Short mmCIF file of C-alpha atoms in Angstrom, two decimals:
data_model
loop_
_atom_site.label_atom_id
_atom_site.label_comp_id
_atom_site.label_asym_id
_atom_site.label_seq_id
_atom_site.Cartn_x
_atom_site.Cartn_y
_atom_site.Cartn_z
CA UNK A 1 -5.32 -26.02 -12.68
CA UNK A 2 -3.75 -28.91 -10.77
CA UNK A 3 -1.67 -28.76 -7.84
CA UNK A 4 1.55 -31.54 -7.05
CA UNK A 5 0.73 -33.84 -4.25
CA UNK A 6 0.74 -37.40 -4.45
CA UNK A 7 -1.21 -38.05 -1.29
CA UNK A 8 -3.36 -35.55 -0.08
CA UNK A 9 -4.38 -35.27 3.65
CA UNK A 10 -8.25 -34.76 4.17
CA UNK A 11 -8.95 -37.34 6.26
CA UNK A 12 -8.96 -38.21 9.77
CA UNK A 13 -5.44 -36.92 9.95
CA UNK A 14 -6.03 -33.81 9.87
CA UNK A 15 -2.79 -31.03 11.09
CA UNK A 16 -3.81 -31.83 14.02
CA UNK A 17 -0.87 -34.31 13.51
CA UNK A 18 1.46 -31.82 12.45
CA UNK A 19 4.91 -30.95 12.75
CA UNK A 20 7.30 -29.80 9.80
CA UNK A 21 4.64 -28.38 7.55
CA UNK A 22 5.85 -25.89 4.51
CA UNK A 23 3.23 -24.26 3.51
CA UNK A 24 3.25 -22.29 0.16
CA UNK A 25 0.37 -20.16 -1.56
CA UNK A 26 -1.54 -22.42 -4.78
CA UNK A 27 -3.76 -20.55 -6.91
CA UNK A 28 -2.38 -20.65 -10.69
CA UNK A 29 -3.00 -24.33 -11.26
CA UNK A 30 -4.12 -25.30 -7.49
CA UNK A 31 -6.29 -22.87 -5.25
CA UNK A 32 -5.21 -24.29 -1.88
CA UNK A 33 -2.66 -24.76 0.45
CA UNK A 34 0.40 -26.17 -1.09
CA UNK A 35 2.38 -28.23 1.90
CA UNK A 36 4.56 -31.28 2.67
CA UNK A 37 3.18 -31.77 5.72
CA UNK A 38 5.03 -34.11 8.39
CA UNK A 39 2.45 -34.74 11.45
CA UNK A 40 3.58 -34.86 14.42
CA UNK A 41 1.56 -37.78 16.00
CA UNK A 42 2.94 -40.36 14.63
CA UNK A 43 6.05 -38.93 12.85
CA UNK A 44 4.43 -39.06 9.35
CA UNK A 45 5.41 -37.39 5.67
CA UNK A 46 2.60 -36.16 3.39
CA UNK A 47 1.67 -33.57 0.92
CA UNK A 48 -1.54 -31.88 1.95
CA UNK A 49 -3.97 -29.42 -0.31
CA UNK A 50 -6.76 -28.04 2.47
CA UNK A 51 -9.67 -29.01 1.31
CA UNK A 52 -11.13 -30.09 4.21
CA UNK A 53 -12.45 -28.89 7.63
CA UNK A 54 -9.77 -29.68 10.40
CA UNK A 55 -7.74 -28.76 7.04
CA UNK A 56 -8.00 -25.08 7.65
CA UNK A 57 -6.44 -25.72 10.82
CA UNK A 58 -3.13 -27.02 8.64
CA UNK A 59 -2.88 -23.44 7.37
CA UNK A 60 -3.73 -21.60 10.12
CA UNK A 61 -2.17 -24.04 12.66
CA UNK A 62 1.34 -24.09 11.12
CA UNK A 63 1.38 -19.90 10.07
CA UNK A 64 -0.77 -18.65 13.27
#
């Protein structure tokens, strides 16, 4: 059980930078949010596995 993202985003940088962010449903090897996330803030490229607080926005912020 292991998901594919180099750099994970769980820090400060939470969605709330967010802008093209695919989202895709983990649970055979990672239960979590599969995403390459690119936050809009500061026009950034990252692949993100909510596991976090401000995290659950990345989900729920980029489906709503």
């Amino acid at each position: 059980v292991r998901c594919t993202c180099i750099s994970i985003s769980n820090q400060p940088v939470n969605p709330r930078s967010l802008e093209k962010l695919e989202i895709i449903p983990a649970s055979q090897f990672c239960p979590r949010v599969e995403i390459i996330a690119t936050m809009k803030k500061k026009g950034e490229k990252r692949c993100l596995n909510p596991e976090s607080k401000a995290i659950k926005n990345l989900l729920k912020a980029v489906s709503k």
